[PDB]
Amino acid sequence: LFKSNIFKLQIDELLEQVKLKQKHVLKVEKFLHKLYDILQEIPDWEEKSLAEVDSFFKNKIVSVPFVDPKPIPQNTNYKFNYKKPDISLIGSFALKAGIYQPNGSSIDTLLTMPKELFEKKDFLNFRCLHKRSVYLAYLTHHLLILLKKDKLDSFLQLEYSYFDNDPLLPILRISCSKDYNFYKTRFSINLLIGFPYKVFEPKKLLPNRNCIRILPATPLYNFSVLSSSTHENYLKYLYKTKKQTESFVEATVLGRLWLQQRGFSSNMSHSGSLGGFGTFEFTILMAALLNGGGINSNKILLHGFSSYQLFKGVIKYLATMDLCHDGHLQFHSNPASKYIDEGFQTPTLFDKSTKVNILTKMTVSSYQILKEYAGETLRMLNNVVQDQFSNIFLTNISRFDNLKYDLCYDVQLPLGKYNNLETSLAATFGSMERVKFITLENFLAHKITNVARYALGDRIKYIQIEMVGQKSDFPITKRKVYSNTGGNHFNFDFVRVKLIVNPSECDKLVTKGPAHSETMSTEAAVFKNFWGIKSSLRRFKDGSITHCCVWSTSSSEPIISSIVNFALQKHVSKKAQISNETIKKFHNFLPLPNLPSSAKTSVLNLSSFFNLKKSFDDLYKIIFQMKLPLSVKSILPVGSAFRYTSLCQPVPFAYSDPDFFQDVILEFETSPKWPDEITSLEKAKTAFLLKIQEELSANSSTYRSFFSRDESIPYNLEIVTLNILTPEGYGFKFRVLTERDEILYLRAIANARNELKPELEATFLKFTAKYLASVRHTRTLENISHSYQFYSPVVRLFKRWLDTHLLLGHITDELAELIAIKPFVDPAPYFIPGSLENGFLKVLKFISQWNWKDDPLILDLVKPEERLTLAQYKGIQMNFTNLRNSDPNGTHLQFFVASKNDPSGILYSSGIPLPIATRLTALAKVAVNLLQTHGLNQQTINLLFTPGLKDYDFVVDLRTPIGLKSSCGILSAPSNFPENLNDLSEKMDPTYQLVKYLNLKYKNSLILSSRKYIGVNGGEKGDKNVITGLIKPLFKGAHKFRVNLDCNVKPVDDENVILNKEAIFHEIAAFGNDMVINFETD
């Protein structure tokens, strides 16, 4: 009851957001009274032939919008005239479904044609359609004479158009430009002309029957023929269906809200776009759902139900009851709906009384694409925790082609004129091919979608071939939509191929096919022709035999990036060039790992990372069964290489990368004899690792040994990290753990006073995220990436886009990886993340509108259908509202990143300064705004890795002694270590510890941020960096006489002290005197 009532308050208020006033409909219907009066004086002329029609209109202003093919005098026997038609109302304003929209809409003022003006043979040879193209220009010829005489044409204009973006019915449009003034309502009047109800035979105008006899089945040509008669009877159904349901219009408004979010409307989809089923068909489906819906005409939706029940059930019927390849929908307007379990390889919504397909407007490419969003939106009505009203319609899903899809390429279609298509394309395009798909915009639209269907197949989730630059408008003094754009004579500039790829098959090299035999089978005939020399005989691993094709792997593009150029080369256009230059340079921003087949390694190739997990498992294999005084029970690494969170891919013998040694947290048996002192705690566990080193030194000469202290724990200086590098070249930093670590931390908090309790708590969080909650996040890090491996391709590069802009020095990699993993578990309203370009652009838009004060981060570590419950996630909401009492603007608690394991929100994002977080969002605001304004290009694509380092009182440019890019395992290498292992650190990043002391001493007056990965972020040499630093706001004013100001300040008077920048610039300069190259002082 809370899933409906909280939705109903989100439905009733949202319908009030788009509340159309009665003032806007007043002058719009009163202008129709000036339209109905002026049309009532439109007289009928005399009947004339086809030849006399072109004689009267060639010297007149009005011209006939004749569709292809135009009429010819050698085949024209009948006559043509104009008549006084019966105008009526249809659509949204006839069912009271209209609402306020800023972009505007069309008011479907229907004009029914006279029945006596059409012959019995009107349905064939385009006879009645030749009457409608002549009478619509004739009615525009009479009304423009009438509207000029009423002097309204100063702000009113007339032009040509088409109904529902279908070119088979010429129509005129009336609007208002900037008593009868409807320019304040912004409603356009579509002067639609329809034929009389079954004036031709509806049984002869079914889908399987043809009306171009010169036959093959014309499902789309009969769709424009038969549905021209159903404008009155089907509207009479939804007129009475509005009276039987209290929330028919309210749920169709939310149906109009949900369908407009993903690009679905009454625009046609066979012409190379997405659509064909929108507000018109959903209100028709709501009439079929409120009049039955079962397989034996049982009920699917209720009549007395509200908007919360009718909106969710219809789209779930659009998701769970198939209509494309498995079944079909039935309807009857003249008696229940009963779903037919046989499909026709397309969308087919059967009108049994009217014999026309109500789902004929959508093609096979646009039918299944809405169903993947339908099951996504119906699952949002099934969730019992999250609010899903804003996730449906108030979040625009149709903004960018790189957002809702995985990849979109610009394949220019320089096809030229229609008669030159014998040499332009490989296809034979004649009159019989142009019988049902007569418009040339539709003919290559499904052909290239089918040619890509053998190319990709199951490598994507859908197919969308988009016609970019194609409009629907024309002048009434012109013939149709003609253009000289793109060097061609088509109804588009070019075409773009868009698809959402599934990562488990999008980069497969072995293009699978059917089995071989003694004779070439019919299933093997098509695949052999489609590949040719690319098709060869290749056997399986278990002994099976089939015809298959091997592809080429690359580190900049997937396997389908060649096949989108391959399958478009053969059967689409020999001169068309398809290329995806956005995701090509995006993969070049990642680190190129020094391994074999590095340029031949796709983004899905994670074999190099798991091969480093083999050596550490071989390293732990000598550790686990070894006898010590204390036996081992836990041998696990919490490093970034085993969690796929390292910015550098794990290459052997790589000493220069900061993520070289994958961190290890190990545990011994339960022991009360551990000492209860902090210095004695790490003194004892290092002794058990000393004998474990003495077991590794005795009979394990393949692996090396060295010791180092980990100073990442504040106030703990007794800890020791065991560094063991194996014979292959992979090293691990081994640290022990027991039950005394959190014992010494919590006893340090309660015993200490109210003064020093905070810093020993944050240093306890340093012992929590590294020892207590280290393996807990490391278990779910490798686990849930098995549902979307593109998170491991993105979050390694999203930090690489963050490390280039001087952000790595203040935030940990876990909170950076959980930021890019928010569009994986909660990808709404977009699709599943499946590429590095899709993953980075999802993080670019989500971190832009990430207001850290009002909404915190609670991302479920759950695989595809382990998450926190409704009572548990509301407890995570309790951490936000109580912390915002003393930290309301995000100055003391900004990034609340929480999950099921750590609902405190401040695990990896506590102790960080707020001002770097303000630029972390500002670099997410300006980078995403540049994509929609200036477009997406490689000038802007590498610009996100280009920081200007402005707003800086300090900017230090430096250069190190040894360039260490090749030493870190980055192929622009690492083969062996030295004889003594102490000399291996001479090729490390010297600015890592040089900036580590920078934030250490001068924390109270300087804000030190720098790069920790200098090998990839140095350019060519792999040793260059830059540090941006800002002064504090409290030390920007004069501070009085005190001892503990902790600021490197000078004398300004006998009473005040101020931080003089002269010694402040030299203090970081005299430390890094060997690295002293340049320093900017303002």
């Binding site: 009851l1 209720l302 007395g304 509200s306 029940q309 969710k312 059930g313 099934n382």
Partner: protein, 265 residues
Amino acid sequence: APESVADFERLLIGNPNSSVVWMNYMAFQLQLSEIEKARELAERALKTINFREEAEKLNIWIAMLNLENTFGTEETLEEVFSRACQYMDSYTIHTKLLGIYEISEKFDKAAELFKATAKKFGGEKVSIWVSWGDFLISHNEEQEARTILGNALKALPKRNHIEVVRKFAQLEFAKGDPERGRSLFEGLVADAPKRIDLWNVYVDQEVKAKDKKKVEDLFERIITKKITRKQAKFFFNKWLQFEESEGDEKTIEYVKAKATEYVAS
């Protein structure tokens, strides 16, 4: 009809013992793709209905199971099963489940539902054995029903032997092997030729297979058995009834001469 969230709930104040409203409400709740309000409805109608109404209470467990048959889970339909096995009878919900699994297109679990109910209600009840008999011969497993029918003679006492072995015969005469169904009638009439309760149910079913060669042969030999006058004249009335339906009035003519001469003594 009741088609709103407020509509069917108001009828519960007027009709507390009516689970038929919640039987349409669970069809009205789960039709909107949210069966959690439909699983709430079968839970609510259990605590709203009167406990003296057993026709709606056992059907309430049959409603939540049949909803679980298409739209449920693996252990959720079984946790509702053992809840009905404590609040109500065991095998009567399982014989409901055997008919439900007959519609659920799960023949493997229905084979398991026939065997797991055979441990509980196979030894004492002769009812579900013929329910396994009709389900086997409809799937054309005629010897499989004949295999456990001998186990069904080893299942219960001597009173259920004349009851169950008759029940396998008319189940086979309908949809199975009627020659072994008549051999069961040949067995039940050779077991007791003085009990006409097996031969008459044979003579009703043999004249339901419309074989005048088979029926009048069992009619002529039954009059020469241990039968009294009422089983002589009225069994002739079944003979004149069978000879009427066939199409030869010669056998209808001498059937009154065969019975009246036998009474002449």
